Amino acid sequence: VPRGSHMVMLAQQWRDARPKVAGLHLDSGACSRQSFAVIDATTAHARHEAEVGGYVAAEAATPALDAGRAAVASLIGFAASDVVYTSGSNHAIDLLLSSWPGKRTLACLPGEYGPNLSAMAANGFQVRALPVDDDGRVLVDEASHELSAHPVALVHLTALASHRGIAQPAAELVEACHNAGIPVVIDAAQALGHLDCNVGADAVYSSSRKWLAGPRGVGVLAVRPELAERLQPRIPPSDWPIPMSVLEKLELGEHNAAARVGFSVAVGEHLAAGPTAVRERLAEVGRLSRQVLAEVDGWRVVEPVDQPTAITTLESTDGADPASVRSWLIAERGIVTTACELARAPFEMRTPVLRISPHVDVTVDELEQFAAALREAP
Amino acid sequence: VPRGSHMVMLAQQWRDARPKVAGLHLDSGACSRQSFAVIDATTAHARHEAEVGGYVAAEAATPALDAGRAAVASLIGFAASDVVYTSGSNHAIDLLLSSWPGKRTLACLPGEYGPNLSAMAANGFQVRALPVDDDGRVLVDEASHELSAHPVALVHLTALASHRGIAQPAAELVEACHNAGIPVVIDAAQALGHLDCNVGADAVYSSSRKWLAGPRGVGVLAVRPELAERLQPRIPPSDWPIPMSVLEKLELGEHNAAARVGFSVAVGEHLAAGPTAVRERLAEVGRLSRQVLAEVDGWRVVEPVDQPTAITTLESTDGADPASVRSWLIAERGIVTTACELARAPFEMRTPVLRISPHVDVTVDELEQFAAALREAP
Ligand SMILES: *Cc1c(COP(=O)(O)O)cnc(C)c1O
Ligand SMILES: *Cc1c(COP(=O)(O)O)cnc(C)c1O
């Protein structure tokens, strides 16, 4: 017996702070939609660069930039001074792993994001898999045993995977890993702004452009000071003249400053709307999605029906190619989606999937238009 | 006997395509000023990301992105398909040097940009100095002898230094290096849009935000195919599943797409205005600057008076600190400048300098206001 949507003003306020969608956007897990305020804040900084000078404009923006660090810090339980800006989540993990001291061994999910594995390998890490259930959810007790008996230099948990909408039990794993005396890094690229990311991790990173609906080309890396000062940044070399802290070294480099102030506005908007309220809505968006897609011929829903996420993935039962379906949906029906290849999670995925990832604004009629379009798809 | 300025409509068209400066901007070598068109083009893409989807918007922008590659390619004598987007010039040299095969030995100017040296070191290069005159200009014949007798895996020429406005004889050095059978990389961060960068180099890189007046957070790297396919990118590892070309690997990663289309508009504007005409104007801006600053007490001009560049640097003769002067000029008189520390060119600079780097729009009255303000400076 299905249930109605809990009506909340939040959904509409969100939709109306953003430009009108052309068709139908179900792809906030890939790239969400900047508010007018975010777009204006970015444009404004670029204009200011042109008036007063680019570096003086950047200096004058330290208030807003610091605000953004702090808002991020509050969402993860770190201090604002532990937080640093990056180009994105891949930049973030590379900065971290390339800086890591001593024995480079880690454990992670089998469903680990492929480009993360790529970076792990490129930085000379030995990578072991953590024990999981049939869905890819970590088994926390078994993981505890495994890590006590067989130690590793760090654990890398993707709290929410790009290819499947399973909420990982982050907090429970973090205390298990700490009991074994092992630090935890968290890939919160999908999770930040979506799951409770206040779980006592040692490092966390994420991306601007996804659930926080900020500009592309920005991410964040946060590292606790105990860990931060053990790190040995690749650039500059460790025997270099100009003395600066580890986090100052990691944040070093040319970047789009405007996009960073854009981001700060965007986290601001998340906090303003209420983290907890937004997350409960996204969880409900997921419920409704899986109810509506429960019965489509040629597609089965992969996630349990009451996982607290907005990510819902569909596997074809008659050998249809999601990349093609995605293309059709865009060109013909203006419906934006993501096709996840095996390369996204090579040691878990056996077959590609179609991923919907709608934000708070989605309606039940919109989920029906998708299901309709999904039926009459070549 | 001084000479008048060659009046050209170019100066004014440029000024009027940009926002009104608040005070006086003499710092295009650090960060220039985006045109209204550039700013609008960037904003437009971000808005489009929000309507049609971020990745579909990026795909739809391939025309403009490819245009920008091509415009860059024409300025350096490469093919558009040799050109790739980066975060900036430091990103560029790191991508290149981290990818370099076999024996890692190079020669460069003693006046090499400090962060370049830092990257060279971090990638395990042995770095030798090329012979130069008193100004830091390379002596081409002596360099030819040195390289024949004592070979090196590549030569890194900064065609125009950040700390001093010496135009390096790039073309003449490139043929000398090729005669010795040695490839040449060029740091054209200051030179692109400023000097003739069509000189037959094997690789060239530059930055969006300087003389081409594009967005921050963007640069370009161009590599000839002979060299490109010998390169072995750090990420992904060389034994990785997904097969793609070297340049495709280097351009991989999250980035601000909007800023890239911004950049394309900006190179467009340079080509539209006429490279050769713009360069001759910048050269004249330099002449006028050095005439006007010829006699200031407590400051001497460093560059010969007829170097074809807009970069003019001042050394204090009564132990004044340029960082302080720069700060005063901004806070009190709204004049934007750059203070170059020793760390910018550690193996050449003995003492800090104040750097002016005005674009085509500068007037002679503006250069007088600076000289005036430079006299009554604490
Ligand atoms: C989006 C994604 C990333 C990649 O981050 P970039 O911002 O593209 O560098 C990382 N991990 C997850 C789980 C992803 O969904
Ligand atoms: C500006 C500058 C750079 C640094 O490039 P980024 O865009 O800041 O990464 C490189 N070399 C020269 C000569 C510089 O002036």
Numbering used by the authors:
A (entry chain A), B (entry chain A): -6 to 371
Source paper text:
EgtE and Egt2 are PLP-dependent C-S lyases in EGT biosynthesis, leading to the conversion from sulfoxide 4 to EGT.
The PLP-binding pocket is mainly composed of residues from the central domain and a loop from the neighboring monomer. PLP covalently linked to Lys203 via a Schiff base linkage in monomer 1, with NZ-C4′ distance of 1.3 Å. The O3′ atom of PLP forms a hydrogen bond with Gln183. To strengthen the orientation, a salt bridge forms between the nitrogen of pyridine and Asp180. Besides, another salt bridge between the phosphate group of PLP and Arg202 also anchors the position of the PLP cofactor. In addition, the phosphate group of PLP is tightly bound via hydrogen bonds with Ser82, Asn83, and Ser200, which forms an extensive network of hydrophilic interactions to further limit the movements of the cofactor. Conversely, in the monomer 2, the Schiff base bond is broken, resulting in the increased NZ-C4′ distance of 3.0 Å.
